[PDB]
Design a protein around this nucleic acid. Sequence first.
RNA 1: ACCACGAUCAAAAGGGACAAGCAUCAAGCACGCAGCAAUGCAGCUCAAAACGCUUAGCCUAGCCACACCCCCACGGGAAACAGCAGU
Lengths: 71, 51, 58, 39, 171, 110
Amino acid sequence: KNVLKIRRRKMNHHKYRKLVKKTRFLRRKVQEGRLRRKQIKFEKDLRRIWLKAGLKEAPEGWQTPKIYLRG
Amino acid sequence: ELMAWNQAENRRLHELRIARLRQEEREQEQRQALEQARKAEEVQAWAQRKE
Amino acid sequence: NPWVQIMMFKNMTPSPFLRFYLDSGEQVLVDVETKSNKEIMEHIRKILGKNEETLREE
Amino acid sequence: ATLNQMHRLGPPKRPPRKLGPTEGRPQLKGVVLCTFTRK
Amino acid sequence: DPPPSTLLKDYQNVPGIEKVDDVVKRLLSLEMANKKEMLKIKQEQFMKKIVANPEDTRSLEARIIALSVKIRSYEEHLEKHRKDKAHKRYLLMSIDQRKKMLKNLRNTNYDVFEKICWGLGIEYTFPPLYYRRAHRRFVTKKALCIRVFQETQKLKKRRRALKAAAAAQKQ
Amino acid sequence: VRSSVHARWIVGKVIGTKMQKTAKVRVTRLVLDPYLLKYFNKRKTYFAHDALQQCTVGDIVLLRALPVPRAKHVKHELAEIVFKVGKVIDPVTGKPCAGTTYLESPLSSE
RNA sequence: ACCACGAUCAAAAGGGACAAGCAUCAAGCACGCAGCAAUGCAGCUCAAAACGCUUAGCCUAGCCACACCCCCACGGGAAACAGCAGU
Ligand SMILES: NC(=O)c1ccc[n+]([C@@H]2O[C@H](COP(=O)([O-])OP(=O)(O)OC[C@H]3O[C@@H](n4cnc5c(N)ncnc54)[C@H](O)[C@@H]3O)[C@@H](O)[C@H]2O)c1
Ligand SMILES: [K+]
Ligand SMILES: [Mg+2]
Ligand SMILES: [Mg+2]
Ligand SMILES: [Mg+2]
Ligand SMILES: [Mg+2]
Ligand SMILES: [Mg+2]
Ligand SMILES: [Mg+2]
Ligand SMILES: [Mg+2]
Ligand SMILES: [Mg+2]
């Protein structure tokens, strides 16, 4: 058979890889900011829980971990 | 009256079941007799080969 | 009989049987081994089904 | 699909209908900003 | 494991095997055989210890015992061969097949199911109701929600004593 | 004889025994699929009071409605264990069975 | 009329049932049980779709909801045609 459908996908993937290459430093700064907000959004969800349960502070000895950092 | 008739229908079917099971034991015993005979020869043959 | 619970059980016993639970608390055991499906339907109609008169009235 | 599969998914769901440029309305009032010709 | 001096399952019931030379006893023992021969002795030991009819090999009990011996052999194999993915697969499949057998034995013959579990040292476990990844966000939140519950319970008990104390003072 | 509970008699399978004196029972009913006109099982959970804690996960039980619910979710009591898990007694013969095989022959007691 | 120790009608309460789309909303976070109580146990819901977001008055002899807004209406904002005619 022909390979015209494969060729369309080939070009799409090539241009995508080429776009990612050109903007890989901007995309890295954007990804970092998203992970920071993701961590903040997670921290708020846990604070909402203990606050809606009647507690005024986090459970004694509880520290919310950083679950989105590369480390 | 219908519950009593249903209990009587169950007893009738039970008598047929006991008759059916007795005829199956006689057949089971015949088969079980041959298998033991065959199984005994195969053991004696296997025992003689090992001896 | 949309409001009657019907539950099926496979291979739990050596022979097939129907059991009905009545509001009084009585239980009706119907042995169905060796019976055709048409005989089972006619049996349970006789012992626990409304007769044609009771249905005509309704 | 099997009957069990058709049961699980249920009746086919139509895609929500897209509203055109009139936003599902027969006519709209407008104020002319500019006139021109198109090829 | 059975002692190495144990005779093979085939030669254990031949007449006069106890009067042969010691050399002949070594050649018909487990010491001079492959591991598969030692597993046949283990299976026979479990069959006589557990099942009612040790000669019924097609019963659900015998299959669980036979498969349990294979499972132990795979575990011993993988103890020495930890990167053997082929045998790691056979072990996990065999464990799953035994659980399916135990489920069907528990449903049909509970008295025999109990003797199989005692005899083979199996702790039957019911499967989890849901299969879903416990990722970091869920694991952390579930831990926090349990700590919040534990703290709320303590505070609710310190609101019982103060109310109790004040009520007594009125008297 | 009156009760405020809707389901007066229901049979189900015990799926939980972790509550004190309470068995969690899965009850299945047949429901007609209006489009396919085929009946499919619809399952509902009922809590049943089990005073003697005699219920085992997997046994078929008969539940009777209580006159009034004894708890938020406990509206029924254990009336009868129909099929004890792995210890079924054949109702037609009264003999113990393991699946489709008899453990004691009906011919033993004639 | 009066009571029916009833009938009719019909609240509150208890049980059951009850829209659509989205699973890129997949976990909810106290949502259970036992006990006269004290208190004890750690459970409860959920891919057979919980929790959640969005859309919509509905199952039309009619029904539900609302009645300027703050779900409510002591209080507050404020000064009300979603009664008819009318602007
Ligand atoms: N999700 C469960 O944990 C679960 C539990 C019991 C039965 N099932 C059955 O699994 C099938 C898939 O259900 P779906 O389409 O809603 O899920 P899905 O395929 O959309 O997967 C969603 C979640 O269910 C899990 N899952 C997927 N297939 C499963 C399977 N065969 N058995 C168990 N878990 C599975 C996935 O790992 C994921 O956590 C259905 O037949 C369902 O009845 C699923
Ligand atoms: K309002
Ligand atoms: Mg392209
Ligand atoms: Mg009401
Ligand atoms: Mg899915
Ligand atoms: Mg998206
Ligand atoms: Mg609206
Ligand atoms: Mg208002
Ligand atoms: Mg107005
Ligand atoms: Mg007007």
